[PDB]
Amino acid sequence: MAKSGIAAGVNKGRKTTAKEVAPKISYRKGASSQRTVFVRSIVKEVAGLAPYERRLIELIRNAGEKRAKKLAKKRLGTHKRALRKVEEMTQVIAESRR
Amino acid sequence: GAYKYLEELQRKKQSDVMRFLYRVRCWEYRQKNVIHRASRPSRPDKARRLGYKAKQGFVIYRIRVRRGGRKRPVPKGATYGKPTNQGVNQLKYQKSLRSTAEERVGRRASNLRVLNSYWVNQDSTYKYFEVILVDPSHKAIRRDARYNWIVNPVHKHREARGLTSAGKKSRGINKGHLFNKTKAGRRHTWKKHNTLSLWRYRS
Amino acid sequence: AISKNLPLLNNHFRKHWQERVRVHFDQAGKKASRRQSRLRKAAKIAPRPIDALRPVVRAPTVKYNRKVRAGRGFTLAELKAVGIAPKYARTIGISVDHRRQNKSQETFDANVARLQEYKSKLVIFDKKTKASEVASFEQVDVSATFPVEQPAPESGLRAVEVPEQTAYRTLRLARNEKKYKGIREKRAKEKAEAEAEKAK
Amino acid sequence: KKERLTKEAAAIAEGKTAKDVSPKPVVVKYGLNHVVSLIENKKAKLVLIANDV
Amino acid sequence: PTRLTKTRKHRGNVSAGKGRIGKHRKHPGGRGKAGGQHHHRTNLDKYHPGYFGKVGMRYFHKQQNHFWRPEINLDKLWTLVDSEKKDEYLSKSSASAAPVIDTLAHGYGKVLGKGRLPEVPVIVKARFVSKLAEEKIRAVGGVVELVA
Amino acid sequence: KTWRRWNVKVNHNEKRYATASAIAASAVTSLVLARGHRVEQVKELPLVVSNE
RNA sequence: GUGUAAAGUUCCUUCGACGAGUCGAGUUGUUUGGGAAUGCAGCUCUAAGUGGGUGGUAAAUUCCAUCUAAAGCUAAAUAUUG
RNA sequence: UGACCUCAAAUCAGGUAGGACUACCCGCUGAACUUAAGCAUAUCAAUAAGCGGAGGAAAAGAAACCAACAGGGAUUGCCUCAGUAGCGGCGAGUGAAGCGGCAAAAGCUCAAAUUUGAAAUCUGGCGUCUUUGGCGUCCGAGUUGUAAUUUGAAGAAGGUAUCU
């Protein structure tokens, strides 16, 4: 079925007849909406960039991807957040080249 | 409406606009009394999030609280004990500055109930907080089915007992394995785990 | 301080333990007052039962898989299958749990059958109902009228069918496959990329 | 507004829907949330913003 | 009862059985397990070897439910068959119809192979079996069916 | 101290053993007489009376 | 009872706003059974939107599971040298 | 000649706080005697003393939970887990949690939404009445947002078979 039917190994456990579960609305929490995408784009225009974010952009422009990630981790704290920030600052650069 | 924009803009605290506003307002708040009445929220959206309503009986105080740790107030640094207890500097208060702000504001306006509070601004010497208070004797509060609850006497000085958001944060009142010691009250849990329970028919 | 061939003890009595000694002298008094509270609660709402109908759920952990016990409330899907709204269900003696879901069909079917059994014995009064009909009913105990019942263990006679591979060998092979799955997959991925990259 | 409501209450006595007796209002929109939502829906023809908020 | 204790018999004798030289004192030798490496070494070395030191690796957050696996041997396996029907089963069991013994439903995780089975086919349902337990079950014409 | 032991556990089977033994002893005339009961004018033990 | 009212129930479509000097990170002190760091607090840094937290060994890569923080109320079972 | 914002004054109209008690309760602050046969980490003890705040209970509470199961399902307490995992000059010592049985069980509320064809909301004064309040009216609060509507278990806006 879905489990191997035995008590050891890969995918161990008792076989049961699966029943499809209606997803909970709480699991939609990370999803984006038209309302928040719109509001965040205008606030970006009004607010602008942070001092460390301008510093990140210069490092990316000067081909310092390795340098920018080390800065973005030092600022944001974690490597996972630093990766997303560097990707976001490259997209900002990609939108300034037209 | 505009509250969503207000929310998204206050998260850009390092933008030029917000930095300018923080400079100006920090100077202005520093020029007033340590505790003073705010004619209105400086962050209406943040006040709304925390239960504030633009009604009669809702009050805002701004307060200014000194930053840093808690120096041990022993004379000349002499602790008179074992070397593990000789620290005087690098010691920390177990409550947040937000809680101190709430308690001092609640002490000043002793006829009101501290509803909640929020951070407004900051410098090297002070943090600035705005405290949302509710008047329990005002009929606009007493006849409000959503705010009658704070009129009942179990909410007398809830900020002094750690029952606000900041107080419950500092008490460790959260669910899960990371809060085993403080989930239901640290001292209650300790007393429960250090009580000898003896029954009539001993097992 | 340590003398003779005796077990080494851990008697945690170095604090002010005598200030926190709870002796349950009131066990019988609490039993009696608990019974009186229970009678008062029952007599207040008779003939409506004092207990809400509870579901039957599997106990968690590899140690209590076999057992089945009373849950907290019926899931929204289970009540949906019998056509009862949760807001309405809470007012006719049925407990609801918005947190539990039904990944599998067995517990779902057990609880749907349980809800349908309770629903067949339900009689909901109204304004037209007179006290003569209400007095015709006795306050039942729902926890006993719809008990949680363990599925019977399999027993009796069945045909013997012997696979070629022993059960012990099957368990050993399952353990070995689980133990080396990651390294074998890494080895296979490296082998495939090597023999399909230079074979370009 | 009190006079308009009095007229509409007179009209509901006659059996009418009270929407025919009162014309559709053409007025100034105010309120920050209301006006922001109007702008976001491309319904505002002109917005006057105070300079001393 | 206090009337049966030797405290009642020591009344009238000066030292209450503690000696005139030794003089029962507060805590000679220390409190608890004091001096286990210094002056109580002769006791702990003789009676509790292995007391001091570390052995093995730690296990942060050990949940004992993972390791639940009660054992049942083969000489105790037929006690799980219904008592009122054991004697009929011991006679009429064959390859076509043998009793089913659900060991997990009786609270057992592994079937071990100590003892001897009746020379009677059985169907044993287990989470785990030992090599010899399953060899003995197959020899009487039975089978082990793995469950979870 | 109040946390002295006051109640004592007895095995249920042993308690029932003793109850049965006492019921059996109630039918022995010598035991009932040594027990102090003025039963010399009862013709036989056990003494059973009608349900009225 | 002013019940052409209020609420629920089936199905389809388009949507579905969800709390920031906060989360998180470093360091310092204290505390915890929490051990490359359990909670709390100070200071420095400081977010995101299928994102965020947790999954008791630090790290990167790939998955999976499970909830939905930074806002709030709520009887009973529990405590009780006043 | 008048608004607004901010800030004042009044023996202004009407309210509210303080202090007491100590057994239990919510926090802060915080030892040392003592044990380690000495002693400094440790222990006593996250205790005593000190400070702030309540109630008939308090607190906690409807998962940013537990788990790793065939999954449980707010909080609390008891029995057990368990003197266990772990922590500890790994010494003296110390030390929980999940599951399981039970007592008791009860669920929910905001913020973020344009009422926009009508601030529909509310304190107060005055009058009146059948007065823990209703009705009328007038100032005021409030659009820098008071009502109705929704709270993630959802739900909204359109359409929808009609029923309860």
Q: Contact, B116 vs B51, CB < 8 A?
A: yes
Does at least one atom of strand H sit less than 7 Å from the CB of E104? Answer: yes
Given in angstroms, what resolution was this structure solved at? 2.7
B72 burial type by CB count under 10 A (0-12 exposed, 13-18 middle, 19+ buried): middle
**Are the C-beta atoms of B114 and B92 separated by less than 8 Å?**
no
Query: What is the C-alpha end-to-end distance of chain D, expressed in Å?
Result: 29
Type of residue numbered E131: K
- How close A29 gets to chain C, by Cα (Å)? 17
CB count in 10 Å sphere of residue D35: 19
Quick check: B90 CB within 7 A of strand H?
no
Which residue has 């296990």 as its token pair?
E59
DSSP annotation of D41: T
CA of B158 to C1' of H138 (A): 39
CB contact under 8 A, A6 and C106: no
Nearest to A9 among C102, C103, C177 (CB): C177
Which residues 52-91 of chain A have a CB within 8 Å of chain C?
A: none
Q: How far is the CA of E28 from the C1' of H35 (A)?
A: 14
Report d(CA C13, CA E50) in Å as an integer: 26
Please state whether strand H lies within 7 Å of residue B162 at its CB atom: yes
Contact (CB, 8 A) for B36 and B58: no
Closest nucleotide to the alpha carbon of D17, via C1': H117
Residue with tokens 């006791």: E43
Q: Is E71 exposed, middle or buried (0-12, 13-18, 19+ CB in 10 A)?
A: middle
Give the closest residue to B197 by CA, choosing from C11, C12, C13, C22.
C22
* Yes or no, beta carbons of C181 and A10 under 8 Å apart: yes
Q: What three-state secondary structure class fits E59? A: coil
Whole-number CA gyration radius for chain A: 22
Cβ(B70)–Cβ(B93) below 8 Å = yes
- Whether the link from the prior residue into C47 is cis, omega within 30° of 0, is yes
Under 8 Å between Cβ of E75 and C42: no
* Interface C-E: count of C-beta contacts within 8 A: 100
User: Is A25 within 8 Å of chain C by CB?
Assistant: no
Residue E146's DSSP bridge partners are E126
Inter-chain CB proximity C24 and B195 less than 8 Å: no
Chain C residues close to B194, C-beta within 8 Å: 15, 17, 20
Q: What are phi and psi of E144, to 5 degrees?
A: -110, 125
CB within 7 A of strand H (chain C, 51-90):
52, 54-55, 57-67, 69-73, 76, 86-87, 90
Q: Which amino acid does the sequence have at A34?
A: Q
Q: What residues of B are in contact with residue A47 (Cβ under 8 Å)?
A: 9, 12, 15-18
Query: Which residues numbered 165-194 in chain B sit less than 7 A from strand H, measured from CB?
Result: 167-168, 170-171, 173-178, 180-194
- CA dist., res. B84 & res. B74, Å (int): 15
Q: Are the Cβ atoms of E96 and C155 closer than 8 angstroms?
A: no
CB contact under 8 A, C103 and A7: no
Task: Single out the residue of E93, E140, E98, E100 nearest to residue E116, CA to CA.
Answer: E140
Distance from CA of A72 to the nearest CA of C (A): 32
Alpha-carbon distance of B162 to B171, in angstroms, equals 7
Which tokens go with B52? 């504030």
Measured between CB atoms, does E143 come within 8 Å of chain C?
yes
Q: How many residues does chain E have?
A: 148
- For residue B198, give both structure tokens: 């003896």
Experimental method: cryo-EM
Contact flag A19-C177 (C-beta cutoff 8 Å): no
Shortest-distance nucleotide from A26 CA to C1' = H152
Q: How far is CA C119 from CA C53, C88, C99, C124, F43, in A?
A: 10, 13, 23, 10, 64
- CB spacing of D33 vs B5 below 8 angstroms: no
Say which residue the tokens 């301080």 belong to. Answer: C1
- Torsions phi, psi for C28 (to 5 deg): -70, -40
Handedness of CA C163, C165, C171, C176 (dihedral sign): negative
Chain position carrying tokens 């917000």: B18
What the block records as the tokens of C121 is: 């014995």
**B185 vs chain C: nearest CA distance in angstroms?**
17
| Contact present, D45 and B10 (Cβ < 8 Å) | no
Query: Which one of B191, B195, B199 has the shortest CB-CB distance to C27?
Result: B199
Chain A, chain E: beta-carbon pairs less than 8 Å apart = 19
Partners of B118 in the β-ladder: B130
Beta bridge partners of C158: E98
* Kind plus residue range of the DSSP H or E element containing A29: none
Q: Chains that contact F by 3+ CB pairs under 8 Å?
A: B, C
* CB burial readout A5-38, b (16+ within 10 A) else e: ebbbbeebebeeeeeeeeeeeeeeeeeeeeeeee
CA-atom Rg of chain D in angstroms? 16
- Please tell me what DSSP assigns to residue F25: H
CA–CA separation, C128 and C145 (whole Å): 28
- In chain C, which residues have their Cβ closer than 8 Å to the Cβ of F3? 21, 23
Contacts with B, C 23-82, CB within 8 Å: 23-25, 27
Q: How far apart are CA B132 and CA B128, in angstroms?
A: 13
Angle (CA) B100-B102-B105 rounded to 5° is 105
Q: Of all nucleotides in the shown strands, which has a C1' nearest the CA of E62?
A: H85
Chain-centroid distance of CA B160 in Å reads 9
A75's CB contacts (< 8 A; 6+ apart) are: A52, A82, A85
Degrees (nearest 5) of the Cα angle C135, C136, C139?
75
Q: Which nucleotides of G are covered by protein (CB under 7 A)?
A: 8-10, 15-26, 28-35, 38-57, 59-61, 66-68, 70-74, 78-81
CA-to-CA distance for A93 and B18, rounded, in angstroms?
A: 23
Chains F and A touch (3+ CB pairs under 8 A): no
The residues, any chain, with a CB within 8 Å of residue B89's CB and separated by 6 or more, are B69, B71, B72
DSSP assignment of chain C equals: ---SS-PPP-----S-GGGGEEE-TTHHHHHHHHHHHHHHHHHHHTTS-SS-B--EEEPPSTTTSS-EEE-S-B-HHHHHHTT--HHHHTTTTB-B-SS---SBHHHHHHHHHHHHHHHHH-----TT--HHHHTT-----HHHHS---PPPPP-SEE-----SS-HHHHHHHHHHHHHHHHHHHHHHHHHHHHHHHTT-
Extract the tokens encoding F43: 């013709």
Touch between chain B and chain A: 3 or more Cβ pairs under 8 Å: yes
* Residue pair C71/C56 in contact by the 8 Å Cβ criterion: yes
Instruction: Assess whether C12 (CB) lies less than 7 A from strand H.
Output: yes
Note the CA–C1' distance, C88 to G9, in angstroms.
11
Rg (CA), chain E: 29
CA E6 to chain centre: 38
SS3 at position E80: helix
List CB contacts (< 8 A) between B3 and chain D. 33
Structure tokens at A43: 């606030």
User: Is C162 at the interface with chain B, CB within 8 A?
Assistant: no
Which residues of F have a CB under 8 Å from any CB of C? 1-3
* Closest to B126 (Cα-Cα) out of B102, B107, B101, B89: B101
Cα-Cα end-to-end distance for chain A: 55
